[PDB]
Amino acid sequence: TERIRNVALRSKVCPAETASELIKHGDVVGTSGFTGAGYPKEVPKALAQRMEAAHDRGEKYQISLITGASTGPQLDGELAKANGVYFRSPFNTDATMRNRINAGETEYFDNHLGQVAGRAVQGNYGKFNIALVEATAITEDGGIVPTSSVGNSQTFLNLAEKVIIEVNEWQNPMLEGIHDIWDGNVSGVPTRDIVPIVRADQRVGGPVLRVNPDKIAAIVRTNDRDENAPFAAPDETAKAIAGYLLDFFGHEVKQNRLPPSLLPLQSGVGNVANAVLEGLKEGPFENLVGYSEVIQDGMLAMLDSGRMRIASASSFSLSPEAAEEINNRMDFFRSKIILRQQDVSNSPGIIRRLGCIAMNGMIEADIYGNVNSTRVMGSKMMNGIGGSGDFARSSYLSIFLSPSTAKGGKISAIVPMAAHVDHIMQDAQIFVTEQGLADLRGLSPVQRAREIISKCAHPDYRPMLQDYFDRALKNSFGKHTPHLLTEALSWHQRFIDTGTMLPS
């Protein structure tokens, strides 16, 4: 079954290596790719190999790389290995790229995912030379069917001088129809349009990305896999966290602060999110709705069981087993899933209107409930802020979930002062660890500290945290948000100096 159904465009098919030659040193390149799904694969590999060769001849060859969010080894991996990226935005999970970033070899800035399109159009990344987008197919009228994510692809196609499409036969043809691409002005020049989404299952657009065929400079036929998520299941720490959260939801419903069907749910990926979703799958809440960034294993299961009615996202993030399941039942799941542009799934106006419940991980929080999502010891990038800000601030309820310790107990997730801040107190109402849940609604900082210390902190660290808080209350410059500046960051420095936050 021919994937390029526009006959004329078949004339633009060429090899990856040749396509890669359209990318020049210094170019700004916008690509598809979100949570290891739907990123271009063959052209980046060919670009990387030509970059190394150029460097060896003492030729500079680097690009600025702007994506939906995280990609995979073929893209971030290969280009970082080749030292071919001088600037990267807005979200990465590749280890090699992480090292380039943390060594200062690649400039990085993690913009709010929902804002990337708008900033790109505003011109913050500079002029876009290339859009490199993966596709399931190209329709008879030249529409570009995206693959396992939408991301920023439509904006990149609009902005780029030249377009390269990778048509990937690995991606299931039945993806066609699952996406909803709006031609409204979401991220363009003000005044923007109202995005008329009033329900999570609402489609406002069509199944294809639009691009002027004159801009398409190359089509590359590919066959290569996405970066698929780990199968590993929720440990006891994660189940405890989930248990506290579900009890909390139970209580909110009994007090009429939440409908029996909760509100549209936003969740991340990983051990804890999986536990939460597994918990929701068997919980007392019916007719759930997902309005999130990503569809993960848990989601599919609930859509399957009917516990969740619809799931909105910009991307998939599945394990091999979950991928297998959806590919065998695509016709079923396709009626239940909507993949949107990331500037829509992460639109604060929409998130607030729908009243989403935001559930996010964190590196650490301080005793006053400031959250670090990104920078270990305040200086070493992990992944990026991603959509956590988009959702946390706009949500009906902002929830942060984490094991109370990290690194086998050598790090406390609750600290006197967060070494870097991603989400301010105002953007965090609920904290959950395997120790318990802190409800901070309506509380002053001193009152937040009492809750977080007693409910969330690990017994190994709680006395230390209480001691810091008590002495701060007695000695701080002001008493509104008590701190001891001489030791506020000392647990972090202690970890740097000794490999643990536990005193000797």
Ligand X SMILES: CC(C)(COP(=O)(O)OP(=O)(O)OC[C@H]1O[C@@H](n2cnc3c(N)ncnc32)[C@H](O)[C@@H]1OP(=O)(O)O)[C@@H](O)C(=O)NCCC(=O)NCCS
Q: How far is the CB of 199 from a copy of itself (least distance, A)?
A: 7
Q: Is the Cβ–Cβ distance between 378 and 490 less than 8 Å?
A: no
What DSSP assignment string belongs to 86-136? EEEES----HHHHHHHHTTSSEE----GGGHHHHHHHTTT----EEEEEES
Angle between helix axes 320-328 and 297-305 (nearest 10 degrees) is 40
CA distance 240 to 435: 8
406 binds, among a copy of itself, Cl ion, ligand X, none (CB under 5 to 8 A by kind): ligand X
Residue (146 or 482) nearer to a copy of itself, CB? 482
Q: Is the Cβ–Cβ distance between 4 and 13 less than 8 Å?
A: yes
Q: Which stretch binds ligand X (CB under 6 A): 77-85, 168-176, 360-368, 450-458?
A: 360-368
Residue (174 or 489) nearer to a copy of itself, CB? 489
Rule CB under 6 A: is residue 362 a binding residue for ligand X? yes
Secondary structure, 3-state, 424-441: CHHHCCEEEECCEEEECC
Rule CB under 6 A: is residue 308 a binding residue for ligand X? no
CA distance 185 to 275: 37
Residue (442 or 478) nearer to Cl ion, CB? 442
CA distance 84 to 61: 6
Residue (195 or 303) nearer to Cl ion, CB? 195
269 binds, among a copy of itself, ligand X, Cl ion, none (CB under 5 to 8 A by kind): ligand X
Q: Which stretch binds a copy of itself (CB under 8 A): 12-20, 131-139, 156-164, 471-479?
A: 471-479
Residue 327 contacts by C-beta under 8 Å, 6 or more apart in sequence?
Answer: 172
126 binds, among a copy of itself, ligand X, Cl ion, none (CB under 5 to 8 A by kind): a copy of itself
Q: Any binding-site annotation on 271?
A: yes
Helical H segments across 147-214, by residue range = 153-159
268 binds, among ligand X, Cl ion, a copy of itself, none (CB under 5 to 8 A by kind): ligand X
First to last CA, the chain: 67
Q: Any binding-site annotation on 13?
A: no
The answer to whether the bond into 191 is cis (omega within 30° of 0) is yes
Q: How far is the CB of 273 from a copy of itself (least distance, A)?
A: 22
Amino acid code (one letter) for 496? I
Among 47, 160, 308, 413, indicate the residue that binds ligand X (CB under 6 A).
413
CA distance 109 to 89: 5
Q: Is the Cβ–Cβ distance between 269 and 402 less than 8 Å?
A: no
Residue (102 or 124) nearer to Cl ion, CB? 124
271 binds, among a copy of itself, ligand X, Cl ion, none (CB under 5 to 8 A by kind): ligand X
Residue (266 or 296) nearer to a copy of itself, CB? 266
Q: How far is the CB of 143 from a copy of itself (least distance, A)?
A: 28
Q: Residue 442 — left, alpha, or beta (φ > 0 → left; ψ -120 to 50 → alpha)?
A: left
Catalytic residue among 42, 134, 176, 293: 293
Rule CB under 8 A: is residue 74 a binding residue for a copy of itself? no
Torsion sign (Cα): 261, 267, 270, 271: negative
Binding mask 303-342 for a copy of itself (x = CB under 8 A): ----------------------------------------
CA distance 193 to 152: 18
CA distance 307 to 285: 8
Which residues belong to the annotated binding site for CoA?
Answer: 268-272, 363, 383, 387, 407
Residues that bind ligand X (CB under 6 A): 268-272, 293-294, 360-364, 373, 376, 382-383, 385-388, 403, 406-407, 411, 413
Show binding-site residues. 268-272, 363, 383, 387, 407
